[PDB]
Every structure is written in structure tokens, then in C-alpha cells.
């Protein structure tokens, strides 16, 4: 299918390790976008403002180590665009990250 939506968890700690203080949250957004592109094969990746707030919750340098996100591939068939598919990345609040798998989520 191509209108699939899945729930992933991302090791922001792993993807941000080594980045300077004033760059950690922007680089976390860039790595989330790159992760979405790699997983869903869509150059068009939109990041929800709630997800952006979740990443920036603890300031610019103390980004959360792990984050639970939901990647939804959706039809871009609303206008004449080079890409007919886009990935919306939303924020999934969780209480713990233990034993969380990548799961297909229904409609």
C-alpha cells in the first residue's frame, strides 16, 4: 500500500551525539526529517508543530534522547506538484520507551 501509517521510535541521542550546544535541536529536526525520508521514501516531509515543540521542549541543547513519532504517508494529490506523496510526522507522547517496537497503525 501507499497510504500507510506507522509508529516508530527515534534515537535522537544517537543521531545528535557530538553536535554542539547551539545546534542540537535544529540538527534533531534535520535528523527527524532525514529519518522520515529514509523510512517512507518521500522527499516531501512535513513535521507537526506539536512534534517541533516536543523536540524543543527542553531547550536548544538538552534534546530528549528518544522520541516516539508517527509517520503517515498521505496523498499530495491536491495540486500540480512534482511529488504525489508526502509524509506527515506527528508526536506520540509515551511514558516509557521500553519494549516499544515499530508498529503498523490502522486508520
Q: Which is nearer to RNA, 3 or 103 (CB)?
A: 3
Nearest to 54 by CA among 63, 45, 44: 63
Q: What is the DSSP letter of 65?
A: S
Q: Strand, helix or coil at 77?
A: coil
Residue of 10, 25, 67, 69 interacting with RNA (CB under 7 A): 25
Residue of 53, 81, 102, 103 interacting with RNA (CB under 7 A): 53
Asked if residues 67 and 12 have their Cβ atoms less than 8 Å apart, the reply is yes
Q: What binding mask, one character per residue, do residues 66-105 give for RNA by CB under 7 A, x or -?
A: ----------------------------------------
Write down the least CB distance from residue 106 to RNA, Å.
Answer: 24
Q: Degrees (nearest 5) of the Cα angle 27, 30, 34? A: 135
For position 22 contacting RNA by CB under 7 A, the verdict is yes
Amino acid at each position: 500500500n501507499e497510504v500507510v501509517t506507522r509508529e516508530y521510535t527515534i534515537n535522537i541521542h544517537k543521531r545528535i551525539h557530538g553536535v554542539g550546544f547551539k545546534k542540537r535541536a535544529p540538527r534533531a529536526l534535520k535528523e527527524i526529517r532525514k529519518f522520515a525520508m529514509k523510512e517512507m521514501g518521500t522527499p516531501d516531509v512535513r513535521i507537526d508543530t506539536r512534534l517541533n515543540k516536543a523536540v524543543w521542549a527542553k531547550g536548544i541543547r538538552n534534546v530528549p534522547y528518544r522520541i516516539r513519532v508517527r509517520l503517515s504517508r498521505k496523498r499530495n494529490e491536491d495540486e500540480d506538484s512534482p511529488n504525489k506523496l508526502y509524509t506527515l510526522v506527528t508526536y506520540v507522547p509515551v511514558t516509557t520507551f521500553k519494549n516499544l517496537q515499530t508498529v503498523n497503525v490502522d486508520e
